[PDB]
Design an enzyme around this catalytic site. Structure first.
Site, short mmCIF file in Angstrom:
data_model
loop_
_atom_site.label_atom_id
_atom_site.label_comp_id
_atom_site.label_asym_id
_atom_site.label_seq_id
_atom_site.Cartn_x
_atom_site.Cartn_y
_atom_site.Cartn_z
N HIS A 86 0.89 -1.00 -0.18
CA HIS A 86 0.12 0.00 0.01
C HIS A 86 0.82 1.18 0.07
CE1 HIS A 86 0.47 1.93 3.92
NE2 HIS A 86 0.65 0.87 4.40
N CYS A 87 0.17 2.49 -0.33
CA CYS A 87 1.00 3.82 -0.49
C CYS A 87 0.02 4.46 0.07
CB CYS A 87 1.50 4.04 -1.66
SG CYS A 87 0.26 3.89 -3.18
N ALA A 88 -0.31 5.93 -0.25
CA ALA A 88 -1.17 6.61 0.13
C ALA A 88 -2.50 6.72 -0.40
CB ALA A 88 -0.73 8.23 -0.07
N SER A 94 2.52 1.93 -4.67
CA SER A 94 2.54 0.38 -4.31
C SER A 94 2.23 -0.23 -6.03
CB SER A 94 1.20 0.16 -3.51
OG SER A 94 -0.11 0.80 -3.82
#
Length: 162
Positions: A86-88, A94
């Site tokens: 995941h990222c933001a 991601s």
């Protein structure tokens, strides 16, 4: 804010879902890879966490993590676990690592890895710098490219974007 399943042991999501305890346990997530500088993870019990501190910038060297993170995802799978990348927003950072992983471990061309990932999570869109990095990695893995950067009124983009 849910988890987009990519393979039997890999998922992609935004930052909200990544700290949703119920969602992690219900999808049997055992490894969380936070591909961001700014997102903070809540550390739940019996889940392993790590962070790849990169900003979503075309200049960020996400490429330095392509092989090491791909091998990490594979090892988790071999150990019967499941990984959440995941990222933001679960759109650029991601997604790029996911594409690298699919090419290396699922013998997919960059184009096929993208079609597949996009089908699993419609909103994915690596920034143009990550695309250049992915194209270079694809060439490294297969000695051939299936996606190419082209000029446009908005600047360089993968041909996939028209």
């Amino acid at each position: 804010s849910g988890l987009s399943q990519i393979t039997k042991s890999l998922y992609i999501s935004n930052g909200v879902a990544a700290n949703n305890k119920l969602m992690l346990s219900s999808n049997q997530i055992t490894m969380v890879i936070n591909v961001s500088v700014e997102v903070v993870n809540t550390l739940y019990e019996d889940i392993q966490y790590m962070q790849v501190p990169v900003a979503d910038s075309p200049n960020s060297r996400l490429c330095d993590f392509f092989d090491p993170i791909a091998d990490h995802i594979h090892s988790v799978e071999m150990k019967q676990g499941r990984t959440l990348l995941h990222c933001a927003a679960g759109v650029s950072r991601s997604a790029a690592l996911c594409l690298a992983y699919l090419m290396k471990y699922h013998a997919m061309s960059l184009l096929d890895a993208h079609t597949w990932t996009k089908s699993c999570r419609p909103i994915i869109r690596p920034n143009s710098g990550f695309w250049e990095q992915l194209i270079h990695y694809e060439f490294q893995l297969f000695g051939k490219n299936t996606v190419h950067m082209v000029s446009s009124p908005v600047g360089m983009i993968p041909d996939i974007y028209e």
